[PDB]
Amino acid sequence: SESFVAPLEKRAENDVPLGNDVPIIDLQQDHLVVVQQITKACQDFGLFQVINHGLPEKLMAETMDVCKEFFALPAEEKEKLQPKGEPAKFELPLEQKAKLYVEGEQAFLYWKDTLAHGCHPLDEELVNSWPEKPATYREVVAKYSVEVRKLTMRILDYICEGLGLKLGYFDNELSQIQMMLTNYYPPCPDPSSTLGSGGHYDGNLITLLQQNLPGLQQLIEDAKWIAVEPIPTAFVVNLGLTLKVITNEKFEGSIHRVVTNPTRDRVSIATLIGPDYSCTIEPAKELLSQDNPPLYKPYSYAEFGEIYLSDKSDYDAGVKPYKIN
Ligand SMILES: CN1[C@@H]2CC[C@H]1C[C@@H](OC(=O)[C@H](CO)c1ccccc1)C2
Ligand SMILES: O=C(O)CCC(=O)C(=O)O
Ligand SMILES: [Fe+2]
Ligand SMILES: [Sr+2]
Numbered sequence: 001s002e003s004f005v006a007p008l009e010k011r012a013e014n015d016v017p018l019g020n021d022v023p024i025i026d027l028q029q030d031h032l033v034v035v036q037q038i039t040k041a042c043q044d045f046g047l048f049q050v051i052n053h054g055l056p057e058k059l060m061a062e063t064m065d066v067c068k069e070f071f072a073l074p075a076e077e078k079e080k081l082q083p084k085g086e087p088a089k090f091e092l093p094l095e096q097k098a099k100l101y102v103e104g105e106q107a108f109l110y111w112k113d114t115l116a117h118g119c120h121p122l123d124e125e126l127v128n129s130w131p132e133k134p135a136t137y138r139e140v141v142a143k144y145s146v147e148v149r150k151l152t153m154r155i156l157d158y159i160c161e162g163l164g165l166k167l168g169y170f171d172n173e174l175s176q177i178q179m180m181l182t183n184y185y186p187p188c189p190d191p192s193s194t195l196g197s198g199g200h201y202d203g204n205l206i207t208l209l210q211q212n213l214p215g216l217q218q219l220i221e222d223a224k225w226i227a228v229e230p231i232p233t234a235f236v237v238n239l240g241l242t243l244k245v246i247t248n249e250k251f252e253g254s255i256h257r258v259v260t261n262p263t264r265d266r267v268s269i270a271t272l273i274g275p276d277y278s279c280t281i282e283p284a285k286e287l288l289s290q291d292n293p294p295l296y297k298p299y300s301y302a303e304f305g306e307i308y309l310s311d312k313s314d315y316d317a318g319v320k321p322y323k324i325n
């Protein structure tokens with residue numbers, strides 16, 4: 001279908017090499033070693049994996065199971081999450097009730113269905129707006145949401161120590177939105193022409209990604225793409241464009257994409273943590289000086305969000321209007 005054909009320059013080459021230099025960070029090393037290894041990965045790559053991360057492996061497996069079970073539901077059930085008979089778009093206002101979403105660039109569509117909902121804070125109103133089926137989705141994903149948030153806040157405090165910010169710097173308005181995106185990539189008859197997910201930064205602060213199958217790729221120097229090895233019991237940590245700005249580019253944001261597969265489907269679980277739409281984003285004043293002048297002026301997260309979700313002329317189109325010095 002023409003609707004899914006990516007522009008020639010954005011098409012993935014067939015043989016992308018494994019990223020052997022993707023850091024795999026054991027969180028059960030000594031505290032300072034973990035801080036140093038995370039700091040180095042954040043400065044150099046903006047993407048790393050965490051293992052022995054304290055989130056139950058059984059819960060990771062049960063969550064991947066119920067997410068796969070959701071995408072196996074019949075059309076009559078999935079229609080209940082399609083407002084006015086079609087998938088929702090990633091556009092503001094981005095509601096926290098569960099919806100199925102379509103995504104692309106303005107023009108082609110990504111070879112992807114995404115279930116998305118808010119996860120924080122957990123109350124009856126929010127969980128009652130989640131999928132009704134499968135029966136155990138709400139029970140399992142409520143537990144998963146809380147555990148992934150706990151691990152994310154641990155990683156943000158490692159990041160604080162690495163940067164020389166006070167512990168809890170991000171335990172406020174900067175992390176108040178937790179969007180869980182369950183991504184379904186069905187088999188594609190022509191992977192040479194399509195993308196599961198176009199190249200992007202995550203616009204938010206930090207993302208934890210759970211995957212068990214290949215398809216995730218990262219952009220490194222000289223327009224080189226590498227493959228991010230799936231470790232089913234690990235989380236991939238992607239630093240967002242918001243953290244790039246707050247660290248005044250001391251940290252890299254992760255530019256990543258997902259390629260399609262001709263033979264098998266793939267489910268990934270992305271937990272996108274970041275600011276409320278009411279937030280003002282700027283480089284952390286604590287880190288600035290005459291030697292480290294701010295590279296961004298303060299901006300509205302809502303204003304950024306509208307650009308980020310619409311303009312894909314460049315990976316950092318969202319923050320281009322706010323660049324200074
Ligand atoms: C693959 N796409 C990318 C990343 C996830 C998915 C959907 C969209 O990202 C979002 O909708 C997030 C939700 O927090 C967002 C929204 C406004 C500002 C900052 C971040 C773009
Ligand atoms: O499916 C994946 O591995 C990546 C998902 C993603 O990048 C996203 O949802 O933002
Ligand atoms: Fe992403
Ligand atoms: Sr429909």
Ligand SMILES: [Sr+2]
Pocket residue numbers: 128129130
């Ligand atoms: Sr309901």
